């Protein structure tokens, strides 16, 4: 009977919660009590990238830490040269409603997606000087919220149809489909080793997935609202989530618990994007207050702000060498900070 | 450098094209289409000409882009802000849903579901200034229905005879009473006309009215 299984199901949650309590030896704040705070992190706009004529929703650095791509509701996907602020490419999109970007680790491809439920992949290193669309991945029933290349041939995507998928670009078919989320999946972050990935959903729950097997390993429960952003710690052994509750929290996969909550009573708006530093010592978050805060991930003190945007900070990224931070905004400007 | 000089020339060539594309896009009129499954939005779209469906049509030297986002079937709160800045919101409601009920729920009227959606939309924080065009479809079938069935089934309180004019007026006025921003956004209600093709003309007229009012706003002459 349904009641039999439900009463049985809630008993499993009891064991999970009890085990989580038993392993909560000490709060991370206590362990990091003697760590010197990071101090005031005053970062300044070194380059201002102009040319987008609408809101910006997604950006993604390159692996060379010089090139970056950005998408905006104007229907343009622009590859920037951050060093010189000159535009390398301007890719027109078939659908102006784009909510994510991706720069392939090899630099040969970029991807984007949104309300069209398709992940379009573009080839940059062609032999005709132009940038051309390579494949169109059409197997989702809810708008695309995020996407990240694994290789030149594998891309994993999250959608608002409560499922994440893994694709084969050459064949254009889903090698694996990840299901189990009860709400719209907002963002996914790939592990450094490209063996796992976590996804945050509107059901206020984050799940760790296995790319090969296709089954969820862990599910982390936290604050009750749509998780809007998620990113891996650089070691791949943790991740931080940002939701509409105006809170960012740090989960761990090995401990399978929650360590920190980055909340300040003044902040009442929702977090739109999160991203770490090369050392993972700074957790940068782009809120709706028109500003981007910099959090000390090990002390939970707001040390740093990036206030240069007339509108909300949609996206926020760091380089592979951590020499810069770029932030998009609804004000149509990307700013390189350092 | 020479290579750097050529790269800067390329970037300026890109900037010129971006500006031209933006100037071409600014002339376009962006319309958002909402409503229930059977409201008649499909019929309206047919009159005007997966995921998000875009319809492009030109009327009286004005370019309109209509976005039928009813095939999304996900949480609206996550992607509705993407439509901030549209000229208006075309909203469709079927007058022939007063005596019906959704095939899933027990006794929740379809008309009340449309009213719930309309209240959610017109009071949304993203559409404080955005005007709403309200289409009331299936008016002839509604006339046939009301000639035989009573209107009390949906609205418990109703002072009026079972006549099309008064019943339709009551439903319209009930729908126009949901908006609290009475002096910021204007609700333009229209009754669907099939052959006359006056639906696109009404959308045109409402769009020009909002454009002219905004023009008077930003220039201080109002």
């Amino acid at each position, epitope marked *: 009977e349904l009641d039999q299984l439900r009463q049985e199901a809630e008993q499993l949650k009891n064991q999970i919660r009890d085990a989580r309590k038993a392993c909560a030896d000490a709060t991370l704040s206590q362990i990091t009590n003697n760590i010197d705070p990071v101090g005031r992190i005053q970062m300044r706009t070194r380059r201002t990238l102009r040319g987008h004529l609408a809101k910006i929703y997604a950006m993604h650095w390159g692996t060379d830490s*010089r*090139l970056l791509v950005s998408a905006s509701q104007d229907g343009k996907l622009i590859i920037w*040269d951050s060093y*010189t602020t*000159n535009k*390398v*490419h301007a890719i027109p999109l078939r659908s102006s409603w784009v909510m994510t970007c991706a720069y392939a680790p090899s*630099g040969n491809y970029v991807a984007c997606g949104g309300l069209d439920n398709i992940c379009s992949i573009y080839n940059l290193k062609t*032999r*005709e*000087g*132009n940038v051309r669309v390579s494949r169109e991945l059409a197997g989702h029933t809810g708008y695309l919220s995020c996407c990240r290349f694994l290789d030149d041939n594998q891309i994993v995507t999250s959608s608002g149809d409560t499922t994440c998928a893994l694709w084969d670009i050459e064949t254009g078919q889903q090698t694996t489909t990840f299901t189990g989320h009860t709400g719209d999946v907002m963002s996914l972050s790939l592990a450094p080793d490209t063996r796992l990935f976590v996804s945050g959903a509107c059901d206020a729950s984050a799940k760790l997935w296995d790319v090969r097997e296709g089954m969820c390993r862990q599910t982390f429960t936290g604050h009750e609202s749509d998780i809007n952003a998620i990113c891996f710690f650089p070691n791949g052994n943790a991740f931080a989530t940002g939701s509409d509750d105006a809170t960012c929290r740090l989960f761990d996969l090995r401990a399978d618990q929650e360590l920190m909550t980055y909340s300040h009573d003044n902040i009442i708006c929702g977090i739109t994007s999160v991203s770490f530093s090369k050392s993972g010592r700074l957790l940068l978050a782009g809120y709706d207050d028109f500003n981007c805060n910099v959090w000390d991930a090990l002390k939970a003190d707001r040390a740093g702000v990036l206030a240069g945007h007339d509108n909300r900070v949609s996206c926020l990224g760091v380089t592979d060498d951590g020499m810069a931070v770029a932030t998009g905004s609804w004000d149509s400007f990307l700013k390189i900070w350092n | *450098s*020479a*290579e*750097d*000089k*050529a*790269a800067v*020339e*390329r970037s300026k*060539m890109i900037d010129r094209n971006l500006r031209e594309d933006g100037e071409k896009a600014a002339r376009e009129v962006k319309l958002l289409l909402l409503g229930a499954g059977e409201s008649g939005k499909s019929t309206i779209v047919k009159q005007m000409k997966t995921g998000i469906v875009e319809t492009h049509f030109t009327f009286k030297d004005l370019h309109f882009k209509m976005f039928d986002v009813g095939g999304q079937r996900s949480e609206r709160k996550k992607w509705i802000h993407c439509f901030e800045g549209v000229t208006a919101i075309i909203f469709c409601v079927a007058l022939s849903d007063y005596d019906l009920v959704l095939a899933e729920d027990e006794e929740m009227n379809r008309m009340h579901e449309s009213m719930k959606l309309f209240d959610s939309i017109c009071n949304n924080k993203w559409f404080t200034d955005t005007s709403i065009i309200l289409f009331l479809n299936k008016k002839d079938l509604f006339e046939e229905k009301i000639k035989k069935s009573p209107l009390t089934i949906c609205y418990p309180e109703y002072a009026g005879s079972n006549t099309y004019e008064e019943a339709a007026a009551y439903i319209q006025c009930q729908f126009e009473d949901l908006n609290k921003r009475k002096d910021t956004k204007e609700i333009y209600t229209h009754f669907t006309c099939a052959t006359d093709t006056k639906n696109v003309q009404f959308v045109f007229d409402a769009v020009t009215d909002v454009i002219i009012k905004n023009n008077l706003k930003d220039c201080g002459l109002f």
Partner: single-chain antibody
Framework: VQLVESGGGLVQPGGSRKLSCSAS????????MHWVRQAPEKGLEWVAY????????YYADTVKGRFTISRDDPKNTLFLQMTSLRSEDTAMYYC??????????????WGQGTTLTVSSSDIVMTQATSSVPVTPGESVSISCRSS???????????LYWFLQRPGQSPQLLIY???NLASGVPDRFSGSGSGTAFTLTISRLEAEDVGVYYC?????????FGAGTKLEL
């Protein structure tokens, strides 16, 4: 992605002839086009250039004011107007395409060229080696010298390499020191610093025999070097 040039032939001194190259198979409008000429028995020599959009036109000192270069993007064609041809203008005129953006490979595709026979402060690149004997398989190194530091402040060493097989157009191998072009075997490799440059081949074959050229791009007029033929 072919490039074909037209014109040439026999012209008496003092006449004016027009050279045209019709591009096909790529986005011509976003490519900067060059013209390079080769004497009947001597090396290459740059003459002209247009940038993308016709916004920058340069010429060689020996044709300045005499030649006129123009492009017609809608038809994907490149033109060269020549006036009062001198006896020193006998050469086969190549057309080269190039695109400049971060990471691109300029001078990557060369046309077949046309033959023209007239009846009758600049960096110098020097490579005094010619007809070096060699054998398929062995390791051979080609040396080049410059009179100026080609290493720019931004960190790019604008020294290129080309290979002209017998009866074929020049083919790019290395678009900048320590970089390899697309579609060329991995055997070719070149390293250098400052003004001393080298091109190394691990194992070669009968296919890669020919004359090797060196070109710099630090500043115009893109002076070439003398040929370096591999003997076989």
């Amino acid at each position: 992605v072919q490039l074909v040039e037209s014109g040439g032939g026999l012209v008496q001194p003092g006449g004016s002839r027009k050279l045209s190259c019709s591009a096909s198979g790529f986005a011509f409008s976003s490519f900067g086009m060059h013209w390079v000429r080769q004497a009947p028995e001597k090396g290459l020599e740059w003459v002209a250039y247009i940038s993308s959009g016709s916004g920058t036109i340069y010429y060689a000192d020996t044709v300045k004011g005499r030649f006129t270069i123009s492009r017609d993007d809608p038809k994907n064609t490149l033109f060269l107007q020549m006036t009062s041809l001198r006896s020193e203008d006998t050469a086969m005129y190549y057309c080269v395409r190039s695109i400049y953006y971060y990471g691109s490979s300029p001078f990557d595709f060369w046309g077949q060229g046309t033959t023209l026979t007239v009846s009758s402060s600049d960096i110098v690149m020097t490579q005094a080696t010619s007809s070096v004997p060699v054998t398929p398989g062995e390791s051979v190194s080609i040396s080049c010298r410059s009179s100026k530091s080609l290493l720019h402040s931004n960190g790019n060493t604008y020294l290129y390499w080309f290979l002209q097989r017998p009866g074929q157009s020049p083919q790019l191998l290395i678009y900048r020191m320590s970089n390899l072009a697309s579609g060329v075997p991995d055997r070719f490799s070149g390293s250098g610093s400052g003004t001393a440059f080298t091109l190394t081949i691990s194992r070669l074959e009968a296919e890669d025999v020919g004359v090797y050229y060196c070109m710099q791009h630090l500043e115009y007029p893109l002076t070439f070097g003398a040929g370096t033929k591999l003997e076989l």
